[model samples]
Target: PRILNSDGSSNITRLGWLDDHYHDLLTVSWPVFITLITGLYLVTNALFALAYLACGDVIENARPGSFTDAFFFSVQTMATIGYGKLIPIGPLANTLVTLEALCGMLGLAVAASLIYARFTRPTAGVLFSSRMVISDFEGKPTLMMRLANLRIEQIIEADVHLVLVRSEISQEGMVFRRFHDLTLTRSRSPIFSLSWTVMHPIDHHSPIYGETDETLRNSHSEFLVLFTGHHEAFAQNVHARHAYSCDEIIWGGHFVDVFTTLPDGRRALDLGKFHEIAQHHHH
Candidate 1:
């Protein structure tokens, strides 16, 4: 059992197959979604065209014994785009046209709704540091990572969480994964519009206190970070996540200063140096 993402979802169990759900198709890439919808439209028309072919000369002005003529007639009927060149003659042919037109209207409506929903979905643009650092903070050893909002809009009541997932051997002689929440020094902001440096102090109460780098590596520890907030512009809840593996955690390294004073004495952030880190020499 392992955490799939920083949202704390477990990969060990899932409810149903992805292919069995129509909503899952909406989450595919744009090209694939368009192709699938096109295929569906064509296949639906083709089925109605075959039904028209079986009616056998029930349409006036349609070429007799010509399946292509019948197929074009089916297309016009399904789209309600009658050109008056081919018209249904018998009751069976007119009834089929009516049913196909209804289906076409409903199918197009559903497809258009799905497309709009996919495009309008709310998303958070939060940028995370490439690496996490184990350094000193306020005279205490701490685990730290940095994040910044990529958008100019503010995220109100933004909250961040860190979970430590590590492998442990139980008394039953089985190894399993365990999760522990890391207490952050500051995990929330009323209005998050700038860079945030997430700090978790490795105090005595911490789960991984005094754990060496090698020990954490052997334990297969992973730090999962989750951020959630209410977007002011969209008026929706947004979430972002990132994971740090054992190798990505740098010991004795601190993030370089990215904030500075401008010429007019106003504070400015240098985003170009957001990922820069400074290595500390041990005494």
Candidate 2:
């Protein structure tokens, strides 16, 4: 029944999904969740020892029957931390010991599964170069950005998008922020390996064609980069995003060399210099 009358205060609620104990225990706060398991740990043995208490003379050396003695005896059995002093010698006590051992095994397995389930959840790790750079590559003025897979895993069918956003004034004098898609020299990479450089040449038809550094700063221009890729190891889609304002975008600069061929013929990437930039050489 609903707690309130006329309408409903906290009415029936749609479940986030079919109720499942693994996820519930897996997601609750650590303090509350850890408190619960240990509390149950104590209570589980508490009741089991109570059962042992009912059977008289079952445990040898434990007061012909004392609560503290019985409780710790149950703890030793359930935890397999048995001490040589207290032993279950009678048939009834030995039977109870067998039952508790089975109980302990199943209980621990459930808890272990819950923790491992959360730990094993997969995520993609991609790092974008700290700053965007502008330079004339191949004698054509271009805006370039770089990124790499921080993890050794390769991301297949990696796709990327770049958007330019700036304030625009309407003919009627009203002004608003507008977004324009920047055509990348090469957008989709067959396989995103160590490093990639994205370039958008500033040509006549480009939205940023004639914009100068001063104009870009005045208009509060920004470039937003969105990345999505198929992570091969996890078989899941992973994403990363970054934004560069005029301040983070350097003019007349180029990314420093960070790639190399090892002495043994294997290629090596100096990720340490990934974000370093230097002045563009003039023709």
Candidate 3:
């Protein structure tokens, strides 16, 4: 029974051919990408050097039978950095230089585009609470979680969705996982610039209306929270997701208020206490 996280990522790892995995290469870590590009550049130059060596005496003002001289000439030709010290004497060497120059230009252009795309991609920096809490809300039991924007820019038209995922056994002894959409009290925010508390009432209509902590654990329940919004700075849509396993849900805990009024009459948010929770007396 493999469970996927809220981000739709699993623990499974694939092996074998990487040629079909170009997307993964593009999204790799900065260090990995840098190493890959450097290796590719070196390999490309080495192949062109071999081609120049195979061209024989077509290169002029070169050392006799020296592969090192041919390799340096190949580098100069590929980069279009002709130093005038070494020159291609015949049509064959000139043609090879032209081809290598075109390949070098194309390779550099594609690499630059990929790097720019990765850097400019839109991302959301919404911070979710470490644990979900079952607390009082408007005189009723509610599942609550806190989220705050880590960036200074505001997110417009922010919407949140909660889903309850659990395993169920049928009368025929067949077992399967099911997803139930949980209705939230307030799901939309016009301007999500600060902290927000998401609340889903665990009323009679909820799927987990009468579920106890032990029952939730036995059923292998998990809560998936998804948030989507339009970023003001990027002018693009962004999304974030988080999941809380059965053990991560607090039965009688409530989030502590992290906002305070400063002496200068300005409101201040204490991010250090964002994940702090208080226990209820009744629980």
Candidate 4:
């Protein structure tokens, strides 16, 4: 039984009946369900208690007054522990309580499922390459990098994105500009290899067009190359940054196409071809 004193009225909350019904339903499977429910209940209660204590003194106007009050409030708020006696007064308070209740319920379910899955599931980590490569392509020296999965048993497919960013000096001293090469002209590999070539070919419209290695060397600059992919474990954190010294710049050849080859003698996918395939599949 519980008693509540609000504004001007008093009421008693007889909670034992509900508790008894829950106990009966949950105990049907004996040790298994009992242990599961008990564990969830304890975890939820502990989380709520910690939250209440952390904010008990800081919240204004309505305070939990005592540890017992705080504990009950926390449990009710977390587990949607209901007693009717503690009703929210206004819209803001009501909204907060509703959110807390939903979070508490969903969090417990998710935690329980995660625990169960851990014992029943087999998981794998995504693989990424560690080093960037400088290679010769179509008679031009280019900077490149590669990423691939090492596991042979399970061939995991991944979606990959690559971007290059460099810090520049402006009126504010140092700034970054994402150079735009609108054409999907660079990356051309599939299955086990991915690469990026640094030099942008000289055309009437290109800023980097016709620029010699000497010009780049005279300018104090740095480059950052990043690669992102969509494998569950092979994340952006891997192979995110690669640095280049001015001496590494290769000049003098017309920037040609990126080349790729499939392990089974099929052509590799380039940005344009990949986009076309994606649109066809989607449409």
| Best-fitting candidate, scored by lDDT | 3
Candidate with better lDDT, 1 vs 3: 3
After superposition, the stretches of candidate 4 with alpha carbons farther than 4 Å from their true spots are 1-107, 113-135, 153-162, 167-176, 180-190, 193-283
| All models, RMSD in angstroms | 3.4, 10.3, 2.5, 21.2
lDDT tens per residue, model 3, 1-283: 4365645455366894586566876779989988988899878888877787787866878896677887788878878898888888788888888899999899889888878867777888799999899977889999989889999999999999988889998999999989998999989998999899999999899998988999988888888888999999789999998888888888889898989888897979989889999986754
Worst 10 residues of 1 by lDDT: 1-10
TM-score of each: 0.86, 0.60, 0.90, 0.32
Candidate number with the higher TM-score (2 or 4) = 2
1-283: candidate 1 lDDT, tens digit per residue: 2345444354556665755566677678999999988898888878877787787788888888687888788778878898889898788888998899899899889888888878888778788888889998899999999988888899999999988889999888799989899999998898999899999999999988999989988888889889999988789999988887787788999999889888898988888778988997767
What is the alpha-carbon lDDT for the whole of candidate 1?
Answer: 0.85
Query: For residues 240-267, what per-residue lDDT tens digits would candidate 2 score against the true structure?
Result: 7777777778888889888877889787
What's model 1's TM-score? Answer: 0.86
In candidate 3, what residue range of length 10 has the lowest lDDT sum?
2-11
The positional error of residue 79 in candidate 1, measured at the CA in angstroms, is: 2.1
Residue pairs in clash, model 2: none
Q: Please list the C-alpha lDDT of all candidates, in the order they appear.
A: 0.85, 0.83, 0.86, 0.43
- Put down candidate 4 lDDT per residue, 1-283, tens digits, no spaces: 1121211122445684456754454335546665766786767666655555554442233356455555566567676656666555555545556777887878778656645644343322323222223334456444443333433322223323333233355887765544433222344323333333333323455433444556544443333343333333433223223343444333322223335576887876444321111111334
